[PDB]
């Protein structure tokens, strides 16, 4: 809630099990917290529609997890890419060559 200044890992300790959807969401924010250099904040958001049974499995699977959130980090790079290229388009579009 008001303790949105610190990290989410700290929230975990300061957030009961029912506070899942709050802080770590499923378990997203914490994993992407390590991959925060990108934008963990918004990443968890989109991928928040993930399973709760898989959330636990993610924290137990460094290989299977990081692989999933790996793409998550990419969804961000594309998120700000297709968003800025809205009205700020200088280059021409594709031609209808069939």
């Amino acid at each position: 809630g008001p303790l949105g200044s610190p990290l989410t890992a700290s929230m975990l300790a300061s957030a009961p099990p029912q506070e899942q959807k709050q802080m770590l969401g499923e378990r997203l924010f914490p994993l992407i917290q390590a991959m925060h250099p990108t934008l963990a904040g918004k990443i968890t958001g989109m991928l928040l529609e993930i399973d709760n049974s898989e959330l636990l499995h993610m924290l137990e699977s460094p290989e299977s997890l990081r692989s999933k959130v790996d793409e998550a980090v990419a969804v961000l790079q594309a998120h700000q890419a297709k968003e800025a290229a809205q009205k700020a388009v200088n280059s021409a579009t594709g031609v209808p060559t069939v």
């Binding site: 899942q20 959807k21 709050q22 969401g25 499923e26 904040g41 918004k42 968890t44 958001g45 989109m46 991928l47 928040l48 529609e49 993930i50 399973d51 709760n52 999933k68 959130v69 793409e71 998550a72 990419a74 969804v75 594309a78 998120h79 297709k82 968003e83």
Partner: peptide, 22 residues
């Protein structure tokens, strides 16, 4: 629109409720 790759339901994070639950 903004299509995601991982989750097919890329939506903002709306706490309070268990988003992505059944």
């Amino acid at each position: 629109v903004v299509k995601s790759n991982l989750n097919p339901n890329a939506k903002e994070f709306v706490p309070g409720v268990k988003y992505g639950n059944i």
